[PDB]
Design a protein around this motif. Structure first.
Motif, PDB file in Angstrom:
ATOM      1  N   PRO A  17       0.489  -1.211  -0.029  1.00  0.00           N
ATOM      2  CA  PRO A  17      -0.154   0.077  -0.060  1.00  0.00           C
ATOM      3  C   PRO A  17       0.989   1.103   0.215  1.00  0.00           C
ATOM      4  CG  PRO A  17      -0.164  -0.648   1.937  1.00  0.00           C
ATOM      5  CD  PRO A  17       0.755  -2.229   1.409  1.00  0.00           C
ATOM      6  N   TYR A  18       0.602   2.891  -0.323  1.00  0.00           N
ATOM      7  CA  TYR A  18       0.950   3.572  -0.553  1.00  0.00           C
ATOM      8  C   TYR A  18       0.663   4.426   0.795  1.00  0.00           C
ATOM      9  CZ  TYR A  18       1.925   8.665  -1.013  1.00  0.00           C
ATOM     10  OH  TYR A  18       2.261   9.441  -1.280  1.00  0.00           O
ATOM     11  N   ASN A  26       6.487  -2.339   4.924  1.00  0.00           N
ATOM     12  CA  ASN A  26       5.527  -2.632   4.135  1.00  0.00           C
ATOM     13  C   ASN A  26       4.514  -1.253   3.364  1.00  0.00           C
ATOM     14  OD1 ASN A  26       5.765  -5.188   6.028  1.00  0.00           O
ATOM     15  ND2 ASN A  26       5.230  -3.681   7.631  1.00  0.00           N
ATOM     16  N   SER A  27       4.940  -0.866   3.213  1.00  0.00           N
ATOM     17  CA  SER A  27       3.921   0.755   3.049  1.00  0.00           C
ATOM     18  C   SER A  27       5.085   1.731   2.541  1.00  0.00           C
ATOM     19  CB  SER A  27       2.929   0.920   3.771  1.00  0.00           C
ATOM     20  OG  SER A  27       3.937   1.552   4.794  1.00  0.00           O
ATOM     21  N   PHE A  28       4.833   2.032   1.310  1.00  0.00           N
ATOM     22  CA  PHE A  28       6.141   3.578   0.812  1.00  0.00           C
ATOM     23  C   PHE A  28       4.620   4.026   0.175  1.00  0.00           C
ATOM     24  CE2 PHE A  28       6.760  -1.017  -0.254  1.00  0.00           C
ATOM     25  CZ  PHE A  28       8.376  -1.303   0.470  1.00  0.00           C
ATOM     26  N   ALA A  98       5.493   3.479  -6.041  1.00  0.00           N
ATOM     27  CA  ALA A  98       4.153   4.040  -5.471  1.00  0.00           C
ATOM     28  C   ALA A  98       3.655   5.118  -6.048  1.00  0.00           C
ATOM     29  CB  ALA A  98       4.908   3.905  -4.020  1.00  0.00           C
ATOM     30  N   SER A  99       2.673   4.021  -6.145  1.00  0.00           N
ATOM     31  CA  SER A  99       1.575   5.711  -7.255  1.00  0.00           C
ATOM     32  C   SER A  99       0.047   5.674  -5.921  1.00  0.00           C
ATOM     33  CB  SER A  99       0.527   4.604  -8.272  1.00  0.00           C
ATOM     34  OG  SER A  99      -1.024   5.996  -8.815  1.00  0.00           O
ATOM     35  N   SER A 100       0.050   6.951  -5.945  1.00  0.00           N
ATOM     36  CA  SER A 100      -1.001   7.794  -4.883  1.00  0.00           C
ATOM     37  C   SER A 100      -1.667   8.196  -6.165  1.00  0.00           C
ATOM     38  CB  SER A 100      -0.283   9.047  -4.536  1.00  0.00           C
ATOM     39  OG  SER A 100       0.189   9.872  -5.463  1.00  0.00           O
ATOM     40  N   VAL A 106       1.640  -0.061  -4.727  1.00  0.00           N
ATOM     41  CA  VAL A 106       3.275  -0.772  -5.469  1.00  0.00           C
ATOM     42  C   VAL A 106       2.465  -0.997  -6.412  1.00  0.00           C
ATOM     43  CG1 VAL A 106       5.344  -0.799  -5.417  1.00  0.00           C
ATOM     44  CG2 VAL A 106       4.718  -0.514  -3.631  1.00  0.00           C
ATOM     45  N   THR A 107       2.567  -0.643  -8.070  1.00  0.00           N
ATOM     46  CA  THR A 107       2.220  -0.662  -8.963  1.00  0.00           C
ATOM     47  C   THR A 107       3.111  -0.049 -10.182  1.00  0.00           C
ATOM     48  OG1 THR A 107       0.015  -1.179 -10.245  1.00  0.00           O
ATOM     49  CG2 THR A 107       0.907   1.106  -9.776  1.00  0.00           C
TER      50      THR A 107
END
Length: 127
Positions: A17-18, A26-28, A98-100, A106-107
């Motif tokens: 996840p973003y 775990n998150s970015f 890491a797309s907002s 992360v995509t």
């Protein structure tokens, strides 16, 4: 094979996840993702935020992008042209990031897509 390590490690984090201000595991956010991937794959230290990562390492022209290069973008509307996003180039226009955007994870996205292409600023080679 520096680049192969960067890209294969980055792909293990697909779907994570973003979260603004996060830098793993775990998150970015977009620059926390690139920092974490560079540090953990091959032990390359890059700056924390996108605008500083944009000033670090060897400038690369958009036509000369290689796997593992960092690619930088600005924000859509009225702005500075200030760098606000970063991804890791993979090839065929694809970057991992890491797309907002809508996916908030992360995509993989294409720098040649209508959305990213006009916002492209610069690129840097850190490997």
């Amino acid at each position: 094979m520096g680049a192969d390590s960067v890209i294969s490690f980055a792909k293990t984090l697909l779907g994570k996840p973003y979260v603004w201000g996060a830098e793993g595991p775990n998150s970015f956010d977009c620059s926390g993702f690139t920092q974490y991937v560079m540090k953990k794959s091959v032990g390359v230290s890059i700056p924390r935020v996108s605008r500083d990562q944009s000033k670090y390492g060897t400038y690369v022209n958009r036509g000369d992008l290689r796997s593992g290069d960092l690619v930088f973008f600005d924000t859509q509307g009225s702005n500075n042209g200030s760098v606000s996003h970063v991804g890791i180039y993979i090839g065929n226009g694809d970057m991992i990031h890491a797309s907002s955007g809508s996916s908030k994870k992360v995509t993989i996205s294409n720098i040649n897509s209508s959305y990213y292409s006009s916002r492209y600023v610069n690129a840097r080679r850190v490997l």
